[PDB]
């Protein structure tokens, strides 16, 4: 700590002590069924861009390491999460929207994106926590006449809201012609289909963009699974994997009135304080176990080499990862004495220490406030001195420190 080899006589702060976690527990809800991640990926065709289908997935094994080779794509455009540790999570629901777009607006499928096809057929929220899986469809969806099945809207009176579907057919009234149902001149309908070819250009070949909703840290969780559930312990420092939450705690039991819909609990600073067990509905508080720090009480290195150790503000029933106990904590390596000496090293709340021979030992004691006096007082009791002492007492005062001028360019950059 001192970054030296000689140590002066005093008390020195040292890095904290913590209790190592003993076991690791995993408590996942007992779900065993399977859901078609596969069958919605090698399908015959997908829905249109303006009529994108949203399907609900619940109560199945959440395996994301298998969609790598269920679909021939090239990596993930994940926002908020990552595909590497996606299988370690546990959340409420997943929705797989899918549509077939042109190639030069895969970059237009992003939160906070403005464009023609960003706001007229499909729009993302401002904070989208999901992944934007996309791959080509040069072999599966390509026709010599053209792909006239897919439709995209060119004209709308207002931009779309995020995650809302507008399926309709009508006649746009930008022009002044009152056709009111005729798709002739000057009131052209927005039902127009882009066409491709097998011998078409490569820069905007059609895609098969699939997004994932991934709502998390809310509600009971029912799309999880790919690990083994273990047992549970109480009042021991263990690691817990309650759904998605990870930490070290003792898992005490308390009396907190759960509403039937609530599945989490936070105290002040988004720190999780009570987790309902996914298997059985009960109480489980979360509390990381004992802590503090160590303070080294030593004389000089030239004087001795023995030390006295303080543990900060804790009953020392569990010392590791004689004994004198005070409100500042226990002391191992120090022996209490009932005397009162003018103390050298402050130790804690009310106690000091020194170095006395009575082999030399590191004693600790309650602080002497000076020698106790019983100074007399009556109606006739006065002390008048008959002699003095002209004493010279040296008082030392700083006046100025070193004048330092720092060259900002030379220090930061170095010519």
């Amino acid at each position: 700590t001192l970054k030296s080899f000689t140590v002066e006589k005093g008390i020195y702060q040292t890095s904290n002590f913590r209790v190592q976690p003993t076991e690791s527990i995993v408590r996942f809800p007992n779900i065993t069924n399977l859901c078609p991640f596969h069958e919605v990926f090698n399908a015959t065709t997908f829905a249109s861009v303006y009529a994108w289908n949203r399907k609900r997935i619940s109560n199945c094994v959440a395996d994301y390491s298998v969609i790598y080779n269920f679909a021939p794509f090239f990596a993930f455009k994940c926002y908020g999460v990552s595909p590497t540790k996606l299988n370690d999570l546990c959340f409420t629901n997943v929705y797989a929207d899918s549509f077939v777009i042109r190639g030069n607006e895969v970059s237009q499928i992003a939160p906070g994106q403005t464009g023609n096809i960003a706001d007229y057929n499909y729009k993302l929220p401002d904070d989208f926590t999901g992944c934007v899986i996309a791959w080509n469809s040069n072999k599966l969806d390509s026709k010599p006449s053209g792909n006239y099945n897919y439709l995209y809207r060119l004209f709308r009176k207002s931009k779309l809201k995020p995650f809302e579907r507008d399926i309709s057919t009508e006649i746009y009234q930008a022009g002044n012609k009152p056709c009111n149902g005729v798709a002739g001149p000057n009131c052209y309908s927005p039902l127009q289909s882009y066409g491709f070819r097998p011998t078409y250009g490569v820069g905007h070949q059609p895609y098969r963009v699939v997004v994932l909703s991934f709502e998390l840290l809310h509600a009971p969780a029912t799309v999880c699974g790919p690990k083994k559930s273990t047992n549970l312990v109480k009042n021991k420092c263990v690691n817990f994997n309650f759904n998605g939450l990870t930490g070290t705690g003792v898992l005490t039991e308390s009396n907190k009135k759960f509403l039937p819909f609530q599945q989490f609990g936070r105290d002040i600073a988004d720190t999780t304080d009570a987790v309902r067990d996914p298997q059985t509905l009960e109480i489980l508080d979360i509390t990381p176990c004992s802590f503090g720090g160590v303070s080294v009480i030593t004389p000089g290195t030239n004087t001795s080499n023995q030390v006295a150790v303080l543990y900060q503000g804790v009953n020392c029933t569990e010392v590791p990862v004689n004994v004198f106990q005070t409100r500042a904590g226990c002391l191992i390596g120090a022996e209490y004495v009932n005397n009162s000496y003018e103390c050298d090293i402050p130790i804690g709340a009310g106690i000091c220490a020194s170095y006395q021979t009575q082999s030399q030992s590191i004693i600790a004691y309650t602080m002497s406030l000076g020698a106790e006096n019983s100074v007399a007082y009556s109606n006739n009791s006065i002390a008048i001195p008959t002699n003095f002492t002209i004493s010279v007492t040296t008082e030392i005062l700083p006046v100025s420190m070193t004048k330092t001028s720092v060259d900002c360019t030379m220090y930061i950059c170095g010519d």
Partner: protein, 224 residues
């Protein structure tokens, strides 16, 4: 119909999230009913609808308990997922279908594409029932609270904070909505829900205590 005007008072509060907090002062941005709003009665003997201004707050003081739905949609005639919350004495029948409802859908006491078919327990049973609905980010939510009322005059000073009942996975744009008739003589309330922010008080048990409309008074904005 007769539209009697009074104050909506401090009602329409729902749970913003399902995180159990105790003695926490929490504030958030949600679309719901502000404090001291207006009240439109609809007591009559007798179907025109109402515009959906991003939420409706409901209150029924029917001792006979005759209400079987709140129909939403765009043009209200079998166009965009006409919600029917028809309830019988055994279960609830919540479905979206297209049965070509034109005008005056009264239900006696004695089709196309239907995506939703879920059936749950009977939620409907000196009583007051609140059914705050909401549509945000393409999501549909249903709320319910069966607070036993004491005075059959108007909305009292009691607190009836709404717990989340059913969250839907699909939603459509809502513009026009009304209330279903129930005949063989009723009275209900409709409020308007404009975005302001909470200031929630949680007690020792975690139940939601009084809130503050921060965008209503300078005193309340000072409190927030």
């Amino acid at each position: 119909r007769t539209q009697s005007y009074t104050n909506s008072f401090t009602r329409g509060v729902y749970y913003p999230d399902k995180v159990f907090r105790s003695s926490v002062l929490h504030s958030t941005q949600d679309l719901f009913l502000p404090f001291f709003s207006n009240v439109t009665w609809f007591h009559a003997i007798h179907n025109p609808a109402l515009p959906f201004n991003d939420g409706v707050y409901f209150a029924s003081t029917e001792k006979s308990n005759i209400i079987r739905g709140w129909i939403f949609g765009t043009t209200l005639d079998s166009k965009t997922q006409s919600l029917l919350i028809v309830n019988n004495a055994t279960n609830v029948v919540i479905k979206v279908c297209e049965f070509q409802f034109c005008n005056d859908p009264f239900l006696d006491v004695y089709a196309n594409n239907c995506t939703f078919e879920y059936v749950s327990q009977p939620f409907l049973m000196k009583n007051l029932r609140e059914f705050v609905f909401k549509n945000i980010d393409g999501y549909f939510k249903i709320y319910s609270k069966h607070t036993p009322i004491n005075l059959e005059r108007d909305l009292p000073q009691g607190f009836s904070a709404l717990e989340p009942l059913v969250d839907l996975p699909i939603g459509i744009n809502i513009t026009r909505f009304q209330t279903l008739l129930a005949l063989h003589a009723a009275a209900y309330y409709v409020g308007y829900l404009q975005p302001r922010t909470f200031l929630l008080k949680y007690n020792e048990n975690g139940t939601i205590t009084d809130a503050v409309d921060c965008a209503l008074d300078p005193l309340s904005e000072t409190k927030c």
